[PDB]
């Protein structure tokens with residue numbers, strides 16, 4: 001009898017039957033209201049038998065699997081605040097609409113009984129973070145919340161190596177799917193060695209064993225963008241470095257720099273960034289559903 | 303039947319009756335033994351109906367609400383060690399007097415059943431911390447201990463922005479009371495956006511919901527110094543920067559720099575620092591008692 | 605009925621009878637298969653009545669006290685991976701041999717019921733860590749796992765001061781045995797004040813009280829190398845600084861720098877490093893067994 005959880009029938013049953021469920025951040029429905037994107041991700045997850053679970057906050061409730069009605073508002077309403085783990089309390093108390101970030105979502109996902117969550121890119125150590133200390137709450141949320149997060153590594157505007165170092169310090173397992181290098185978002189690789197996992201059944205058995213030993217906490221699973229859709233590393237690096245020089249002469253610091261680089265990157269891809277991002281998103285999502293199916297099967301042995 | 307807790311009658315009853323209680327660090331009694339300061343803080347807390355609870359360590363016990371007898375020693379004895387969370391074990395084992403810091407106090411406060419603690423300023427990221435790694439244990443204690451800490455932000459000798467960044471990484475909610483900027487101790491504002499809370503009942507409902515979702519952990523509530531008593535930001539900044547240059551040419555590093563800046567700041571205020579500090583302390587304390595009363599009321603609904 | 609633990613008879617009984625047990629990392633058997641080193645450490649621990657417990661991973665099991673058969677493989681097999689806390693899940697899932705690091709061992713030690721672990725040196729903040737963010741997972745593992753770790757501080761290739769700062773932020777108690785300065789591995793002292801503990805019975809009562817207040821988490825106990833065997837600080841510092849300059853002109857960054865400094869240090873000691881390391885290892889181990897005996901006795905009072 002949970003007062004805060006709002007779970008749809010399909011997801012409730014799936015969990016109640018130890019069937020696989022894959023959590024998704026509300027952002028995906030917010031950005032593209034057209035069936036084009038939302039329907040394709042759902043398609044990619046359902047393929048392996050996993051139930052897609054889009055998570056949001058609405059009317060003082062932690063909604064797991066938004067209704068068609070709620071999907072409408074998240075598309076129409078413009079001023080919906082981004083909610084990480086720390087913003088949840090206020091977001092509920094306010095009773096408005098809350099678009100949950102990576103950190104915020106996995107907390108709710110765990111509470112609902114969901115064990116797998118997916119996104120194109122996670123947060124991490126911002127570039128110049130060693131000085132600025134701008135670090136996503138995601139990384140320390142992974143120490144607390146039991147989950148497997150399936151992504152393509154950290155968002156490209158971040159410092160990939162420093163992020164890997166921070167996660168190593170924080171003791172978060174990082175597995176590379178059929179790869180031994182860390183996935184660098186739209187770029188395929190970063191010069192960072194990760195523990196290879198060629199089989200998802202094996203990988204699901206590594207996480208299960210991890211939770212039995214280290215207790216609750218996130219297993220991070222990286223799946224790099226298909227090489228046919230990958231963006232050249234040198235293109236991304238020189239574009240960011242140049243955009244940083246503009247902020248040096250203009251004199252921009254803090255979380256004003258962050259959205260600058262995001263949109264400066266969109267130009268330098270030749271307008272190919274959205275298609276590369278969407279391509280990764282889909283390949284990643286497909287993997288998550290497959291893993292979640294594997295994980296449910298491993299857990300169904302005991 | 304707790305062997306380590308020493309709780310006075312008034313506080314025991316108040317907790318046993320779900321009545322509001324506000325924790326205070328022993329430092330306040332230590333510094334000014336005169337009724338002048340101690341009586342005024344107690345007055346400010348009791349106003350809203352909250353029971354003041356001064357916490358210390360004495361004779362291998364975690365004393366919650368010091369007796370008149372103990373208050374005497376904390377005033378007379380000169381060599382009383384400062385005790386943070388990590389020093390507690392030894393402090394008890396030694397059986398001496400222990401003046402608990404912010405980090406140390408909230409641990410004991412939680413253990414006793416207290417949910418609200420107040421101080422003028424909390425610890426944080428020291429200036430040049432990005433290089434020196436000098437960071438108060440307070441910030442990571444807030445991940446563990448369930449409490450609402452009511453302060454005026456970080457002590458002025460610290461790096462306010464970096465502290466805000468560290469707390470964001472650590473997932474500690476920061477609420478500004480009727481303000482949207484972070485309180486910078488004796489200075490009213492720092493250029494750091496905080497989540498606004500205009501009503502303490504609303505704010506108490508945000509914390510309660512936070513604990514139900516993210517489990518135990520501190521909600522940090524900032525209440526800026528009354529503007530009529532606020533110290534000019536530019537006065538504080540130039541005074542510290544100059545004092546830092548003296549340590550550069552003298553060649554001072556580490557926790558030798560910290561007390562230097564503290565006392566160099568006292569001069570540059572025109573001797574107005576103690577009155578500005580005491581003014582903030584009182585306004586902050588009054589808020590804490592009011593919040594604690596609100597929190598008890600929210601919790602009394604279930 | 606634990607499926608993952610593999611405990612030898614002697615250790616099982618010792619724990620089942622609240623008798624002292626001291627955990628050891630598998631590395632010691634791996635490096636020197638000759639009875640020379642392994643027999644002497646075992647001798648040093650058993651002296652105080654403590655049961656030595658060497659921990660490893662083999663055939664999907666968390667082996668506590670390796671058999672003569674397993675000791676053979678850890679000596680003969682060359683490609684045995686180093687396993688920290690985060691690597692455990694995969695290591696078990698793989699069913700190979702896993703040589704557990706400091707971080708990995710204490711997790712298993714706790715699970716088995718062991719409360720004391722020893723090593724010559726622990727991990728910490730790497731030199732230039734304030735920029736590189738290269739920090740051992742050990743330091744944040746100490747927030748989670750209940751244990752007393754007996755060492756000679758951080759390995760000499762690390763930044764001792766920054767490590768001390770990081771552990772202070774993380775709220776890990778650091779006690780110096782009959783010393784008030786932090787032990788700097790083969791070098792006796794680092795210019796860092798630590799809380800003095802002259803009596804191990806007192807020290808064991810400080811840890812016990814710490815766990816009762818701050819819950820699970822590591823108490824770190826430093827015991828400096830016997831001065832008669834200590835290496836001059838200036839020798840170590842100038843040797844490392846020079847070795848760093850070689851990596852600057854050669855252009856080496858990351859975890860390629862780490863093993864460089866390790867082996868560059870071995871030369872500059874005049875070949876005395878192994879004997880100084882082994883000397884510390886033994887003095888440290890002897891202390892651990894004595895402490896574990898004291899701790900068991902304190903706990904046997906209730």
Ligand SMILES: O=C(CO)[C@H](O)[C@H](O)COP(=O)(O)O
Nearest residue numbers: 101102103123124135136137
């Ligand atoms: O995907 C996200 C938002 O939906 C991440 O959680 C976000 O990028 C991290 O936040 P920040 O780096 O600004 O702290």
Ligand SMILES: O=C(CO)[C@H](O)[C@H](O)COP(=O)(O)O
Nearest residue numbers: 403404405425426437438439
């Ligand atoms: O208010 C305090 C002491 O009473 C704080 O806890 C203290 O300022 C933090 O310690 P440090 O910054 O030296 O680690």
Ligand SMILES: O=C(CO)[C@H](O)[C@H](O)COP(=O)(O)O
Nearest residue numbers: 705706707727728739740741
């Ligand atoms: O003693 C160890 C290995 O046996 C330590 O755990 C290791 O030195 C820490 O790892 P790193 O500093 O490379 O992260």
Ligand SMILES: [Ca+2]
Nearest residue numbers: 131432433735
């Ligand atoms: Ca720097």
Ligand SMILES: [Ca+2]
Nearest residue numbers: 134135467470
């Ligand atoms: Ca930030």
Ligand SMILES: [Ca+2]
Nearest residue numbers: 436437769772
């Ligand atoms: Ca410090």
Ligand SMILES: [Ca+2]
Nearest residue numbers: 165168738739
């Ligand atoms: Ca590292």
Ligand SMILES: [Cl-]
Nearest residue numbers: 027030031082
């Ligand atoms: Cl967005």
Ligand SMILES: [Cl-]
Nearest residue numbers: 329332333384
């Ligand atoms: Cl003081």
Ligand SMILES: [Cl-]
Nearest residue numbers: 631634635686
């Ligand atoms: Cl080694």
